[PDB]
Short mmCIF file of C-alpha atoms in Angstrom, two decimals:
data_model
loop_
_atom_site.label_atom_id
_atom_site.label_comp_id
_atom_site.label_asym_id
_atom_site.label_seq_id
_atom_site.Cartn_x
_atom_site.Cartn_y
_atom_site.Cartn_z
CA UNK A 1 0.00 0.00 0.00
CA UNK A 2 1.89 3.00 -1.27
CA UNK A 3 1.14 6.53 -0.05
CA UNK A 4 0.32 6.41 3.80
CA UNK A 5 -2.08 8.89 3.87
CA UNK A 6 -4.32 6.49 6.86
CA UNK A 7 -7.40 8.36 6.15
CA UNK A 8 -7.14 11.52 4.26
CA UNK A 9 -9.12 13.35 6.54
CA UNK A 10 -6.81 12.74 9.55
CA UNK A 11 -3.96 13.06 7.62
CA UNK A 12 -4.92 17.00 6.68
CA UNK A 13 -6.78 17.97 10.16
CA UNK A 14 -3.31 17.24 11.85
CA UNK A 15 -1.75 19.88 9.41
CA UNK A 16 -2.90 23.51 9.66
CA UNK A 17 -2.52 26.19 7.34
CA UNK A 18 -1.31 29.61 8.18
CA UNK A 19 -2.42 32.35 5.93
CA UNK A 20 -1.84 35.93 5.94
CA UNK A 21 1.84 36.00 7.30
CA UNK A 22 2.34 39.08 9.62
CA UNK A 23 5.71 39.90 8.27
CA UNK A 24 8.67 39.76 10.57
CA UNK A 25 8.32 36.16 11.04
CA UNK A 26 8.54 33.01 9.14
CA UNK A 27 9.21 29.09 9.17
CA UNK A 28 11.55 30.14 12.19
CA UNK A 29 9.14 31.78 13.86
CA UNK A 30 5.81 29.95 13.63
CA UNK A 31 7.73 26.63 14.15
CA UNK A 32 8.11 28.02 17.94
CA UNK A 33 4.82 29.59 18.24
CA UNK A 34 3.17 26.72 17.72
CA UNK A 35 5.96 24.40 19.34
CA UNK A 36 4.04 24.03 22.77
CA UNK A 37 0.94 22.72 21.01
CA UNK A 38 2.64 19.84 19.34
CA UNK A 39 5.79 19.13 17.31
CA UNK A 40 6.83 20.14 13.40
CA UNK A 41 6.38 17.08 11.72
CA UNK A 42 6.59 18.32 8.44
CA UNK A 43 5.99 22.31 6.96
CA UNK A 44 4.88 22.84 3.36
CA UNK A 45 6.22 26.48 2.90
CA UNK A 46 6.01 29.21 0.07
CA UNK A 47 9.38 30.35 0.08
CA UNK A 48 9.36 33.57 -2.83
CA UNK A 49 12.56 34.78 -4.23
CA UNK A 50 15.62 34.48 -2.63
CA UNK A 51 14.87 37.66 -0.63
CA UNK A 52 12.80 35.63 1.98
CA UNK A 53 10.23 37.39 2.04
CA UNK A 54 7.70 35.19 2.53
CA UNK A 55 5.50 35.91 -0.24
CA UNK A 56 2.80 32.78 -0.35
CA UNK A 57 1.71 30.79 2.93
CA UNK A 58 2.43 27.74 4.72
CA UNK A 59 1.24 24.44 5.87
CA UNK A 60 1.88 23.41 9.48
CA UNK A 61 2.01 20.09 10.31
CA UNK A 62 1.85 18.17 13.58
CA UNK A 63 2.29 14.42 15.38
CA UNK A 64 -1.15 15.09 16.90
CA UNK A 65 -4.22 16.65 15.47
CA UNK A 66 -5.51 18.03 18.86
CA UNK A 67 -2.39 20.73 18.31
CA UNK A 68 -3.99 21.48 14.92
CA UNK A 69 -7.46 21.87 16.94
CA UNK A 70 -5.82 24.61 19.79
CA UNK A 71 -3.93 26.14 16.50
CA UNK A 72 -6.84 26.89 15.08
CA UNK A 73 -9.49 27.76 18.09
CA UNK A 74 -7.34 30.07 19.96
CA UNK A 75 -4.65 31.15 17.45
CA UNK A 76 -7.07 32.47 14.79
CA UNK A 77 -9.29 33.89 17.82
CA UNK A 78 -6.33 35.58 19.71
CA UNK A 79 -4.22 37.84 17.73
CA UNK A 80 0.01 36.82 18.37
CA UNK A 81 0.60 39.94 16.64
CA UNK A 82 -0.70 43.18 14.33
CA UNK A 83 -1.82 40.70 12.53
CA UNK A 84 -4.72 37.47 12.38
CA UNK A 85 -3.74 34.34 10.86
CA UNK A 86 -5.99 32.58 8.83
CA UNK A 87 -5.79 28.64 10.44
CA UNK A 88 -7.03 26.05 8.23
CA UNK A 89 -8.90 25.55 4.86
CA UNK A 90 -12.59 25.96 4.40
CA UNK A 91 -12.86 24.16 1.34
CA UNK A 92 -13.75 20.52 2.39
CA UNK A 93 -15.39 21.25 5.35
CA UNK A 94 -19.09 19.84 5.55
CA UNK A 95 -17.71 16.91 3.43
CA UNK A 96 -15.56 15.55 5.82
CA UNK A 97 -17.69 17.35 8.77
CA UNK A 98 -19.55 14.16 9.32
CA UNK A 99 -16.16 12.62 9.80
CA UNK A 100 -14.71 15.43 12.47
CA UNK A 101 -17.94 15.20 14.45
CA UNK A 102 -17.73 11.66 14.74
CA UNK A 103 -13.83 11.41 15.51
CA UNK A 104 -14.86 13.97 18.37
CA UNK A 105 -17.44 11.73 19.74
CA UNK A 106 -15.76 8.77 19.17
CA UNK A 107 -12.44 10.14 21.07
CA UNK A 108 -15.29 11.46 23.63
CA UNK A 109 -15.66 7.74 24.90
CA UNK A 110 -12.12 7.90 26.12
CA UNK A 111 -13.11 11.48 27.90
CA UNK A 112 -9.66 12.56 27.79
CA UNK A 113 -8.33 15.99 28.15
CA UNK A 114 -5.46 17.50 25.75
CA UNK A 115 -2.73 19.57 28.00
CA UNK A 116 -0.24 21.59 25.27
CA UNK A 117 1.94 24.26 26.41
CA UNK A 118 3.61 22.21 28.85
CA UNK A 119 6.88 23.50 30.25
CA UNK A 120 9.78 21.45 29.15
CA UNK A 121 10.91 20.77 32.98
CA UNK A 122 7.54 20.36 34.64
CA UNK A 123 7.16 16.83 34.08
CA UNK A 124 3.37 14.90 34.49
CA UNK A 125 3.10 14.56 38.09
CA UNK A 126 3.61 18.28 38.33
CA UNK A 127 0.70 19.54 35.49
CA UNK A 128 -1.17 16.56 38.25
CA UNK A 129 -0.95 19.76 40.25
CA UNK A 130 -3.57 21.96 38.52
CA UNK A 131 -5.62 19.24 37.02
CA UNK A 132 -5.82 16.84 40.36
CA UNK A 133 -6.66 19.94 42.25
CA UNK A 134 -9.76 20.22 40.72
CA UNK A 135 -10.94 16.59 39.33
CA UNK A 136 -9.59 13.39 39.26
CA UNK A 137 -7.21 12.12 37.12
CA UNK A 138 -7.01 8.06 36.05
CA UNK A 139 -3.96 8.48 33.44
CA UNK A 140 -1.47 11.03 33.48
CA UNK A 141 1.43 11.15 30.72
CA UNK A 142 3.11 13.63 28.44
CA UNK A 143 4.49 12.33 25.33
CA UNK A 144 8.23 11.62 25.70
CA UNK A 145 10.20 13.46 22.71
CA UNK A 146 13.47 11.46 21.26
CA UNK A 147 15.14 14.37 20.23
CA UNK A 148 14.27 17.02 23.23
CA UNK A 149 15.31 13.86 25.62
CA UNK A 150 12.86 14.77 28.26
CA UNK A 151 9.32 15.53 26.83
CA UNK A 152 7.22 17.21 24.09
CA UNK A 153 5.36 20.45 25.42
CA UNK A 154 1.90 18.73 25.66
CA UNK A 155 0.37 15.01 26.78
CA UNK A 156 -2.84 13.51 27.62
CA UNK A 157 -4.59 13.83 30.77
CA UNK A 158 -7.45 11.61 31.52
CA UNK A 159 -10.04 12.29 33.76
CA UNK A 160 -12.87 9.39 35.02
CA UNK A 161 -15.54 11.99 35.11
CA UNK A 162 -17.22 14.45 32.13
CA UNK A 163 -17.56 17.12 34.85
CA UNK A 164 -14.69 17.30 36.18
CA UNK A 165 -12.81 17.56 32.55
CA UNK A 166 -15.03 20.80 31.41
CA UNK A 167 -13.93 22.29 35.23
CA UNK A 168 -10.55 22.16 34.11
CA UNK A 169 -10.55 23.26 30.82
CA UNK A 170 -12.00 26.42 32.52
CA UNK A 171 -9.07 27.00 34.32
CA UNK A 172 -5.96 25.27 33.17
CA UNK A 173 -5.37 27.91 30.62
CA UNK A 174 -4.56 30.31 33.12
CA UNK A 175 -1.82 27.45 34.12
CA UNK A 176 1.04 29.88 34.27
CA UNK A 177 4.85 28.16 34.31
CA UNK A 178 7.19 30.42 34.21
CA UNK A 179 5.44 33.19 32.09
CA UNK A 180 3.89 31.36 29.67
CA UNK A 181 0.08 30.62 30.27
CA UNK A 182 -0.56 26.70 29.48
CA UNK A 183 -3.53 25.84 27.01
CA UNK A 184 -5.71 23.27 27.04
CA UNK A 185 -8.43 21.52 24.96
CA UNK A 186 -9.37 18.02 23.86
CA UNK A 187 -9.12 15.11 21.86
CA UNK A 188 -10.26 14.82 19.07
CA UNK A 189 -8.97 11.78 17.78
CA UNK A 190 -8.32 8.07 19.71
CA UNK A 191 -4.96 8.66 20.20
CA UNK A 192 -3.90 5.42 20.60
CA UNK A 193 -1.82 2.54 18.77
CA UNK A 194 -5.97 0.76 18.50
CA UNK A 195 -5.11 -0.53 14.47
CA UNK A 196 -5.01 -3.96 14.54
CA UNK A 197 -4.80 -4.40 10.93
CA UNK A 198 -1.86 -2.53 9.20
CA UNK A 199 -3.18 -1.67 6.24
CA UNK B 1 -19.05 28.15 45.36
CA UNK B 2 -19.84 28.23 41.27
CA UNK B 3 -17.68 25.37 39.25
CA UNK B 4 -15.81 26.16 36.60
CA UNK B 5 -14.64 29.46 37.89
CA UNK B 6 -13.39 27.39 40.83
CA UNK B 7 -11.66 30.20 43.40
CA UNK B 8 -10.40 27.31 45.82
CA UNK B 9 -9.56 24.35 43.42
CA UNK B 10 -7.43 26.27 41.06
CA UNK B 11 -5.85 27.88 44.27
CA UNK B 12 -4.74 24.83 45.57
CA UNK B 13 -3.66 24.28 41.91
CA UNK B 14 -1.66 26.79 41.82
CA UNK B 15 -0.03 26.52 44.69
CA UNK B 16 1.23 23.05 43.64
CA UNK B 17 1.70 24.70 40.29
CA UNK B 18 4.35 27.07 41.22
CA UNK B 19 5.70 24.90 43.89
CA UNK B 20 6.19 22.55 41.33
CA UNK B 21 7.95 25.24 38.88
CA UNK B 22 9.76 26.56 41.84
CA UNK B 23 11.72 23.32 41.57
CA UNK B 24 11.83 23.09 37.52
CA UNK B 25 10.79 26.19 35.67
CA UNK B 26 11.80 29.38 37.61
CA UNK B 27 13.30 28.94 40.90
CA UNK B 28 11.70 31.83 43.32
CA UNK B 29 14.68 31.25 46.13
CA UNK B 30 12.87 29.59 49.06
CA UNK B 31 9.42 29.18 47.22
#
């Protein structure tokens, strides 16, 4: 089976695009902006002229699809700069709506909360903190990152009750570490190794 | 009080929240 694309629709929600470029930053720039919702995978850029000026957009790609949800409900609501980004392509939506709406309700069985913006030292135990303070927690882990050595900048909390989870999302924004306010959200997508068939 | 804007749950969050980044994060001195 060439092209691993493991459902189209999955494939594209996990890879934003960024249009209407502010100016002063780039590839460079966004990568980090949008670092502590999930890592660069893979960037389809519009690189014009040799001058680097940016001219075109960009595609933003990440491991996890719930960083493509946060990039596009808070980015595209909260302005980073003297200028809004345009997150994601309404072109295929309402097709592949049917599809979103059930991968939210589907991951919605697992009632698991999505923690980006994690600070690179505060390990899972301490963002247990916040979230145990409120609710209860059942599972507890931030995805370890090869290359960092210690941890990517977001993980998956899981909480045993419905209530509890919306509580926490209320607050754990505000989750400040060191400066930087955390952001939270959900899952949209199982995100779990649940294939058995390879195909 | 009202959930969701919890004033004593995301206290005691904090709390452990800067504790915990007093160790890793930002250390504050003493805490």
């Amino acid at each position: 089976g060439a092209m691993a694309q493991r459902q189209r629709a999955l494939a594209i929600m996990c890879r934003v695009y960024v249009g209407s470029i502010y100016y002063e930053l780039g590839e460079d720039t966004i990568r980090q902006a949008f670092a502590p919702f999930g890592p660069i995978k893979s960037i389809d850029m519009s690189w014009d002229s040799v001058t680097m000026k940016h001219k075109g957009f960009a595609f933003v790609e990440y491991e996890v699809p719930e960083a493509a949800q946060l990039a596009l409900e808070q980015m595209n609501s909260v302005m980073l700069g003297g200028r809004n980004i345009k997150v994601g392509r309404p072109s295929n939506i309402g097709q592949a709506q049917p599809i979103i709406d059930q991968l939210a309700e589907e991951a919605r069985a697992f009632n698991r909360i999505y923690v980006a913006s994690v600070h690179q030292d505060l390990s899972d135990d301490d963002i247990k903190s916040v979230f145990e303070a409120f609710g209860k927690i059942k599972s507890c882990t931030l995805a370890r990152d090869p290359t960092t050595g210690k941890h990517k900048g977001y993980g998956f909390i899981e909480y045993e009750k419905a209530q509890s989870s919306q509580d926490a999302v209320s607050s754990m924004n505000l989750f400040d570490l060191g400066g930087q306010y955390l952001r939270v959200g959900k899952a949209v997508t199982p995100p779990m190794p649940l294939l058995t068939p390879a195909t | 009080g009202a959930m969701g804007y919890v004033n004593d749950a995301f206290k005691d969050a904090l709390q452990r929240a800067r504790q915990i980044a007093a160790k890793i994060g930002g250390d504050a001195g003493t805490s």
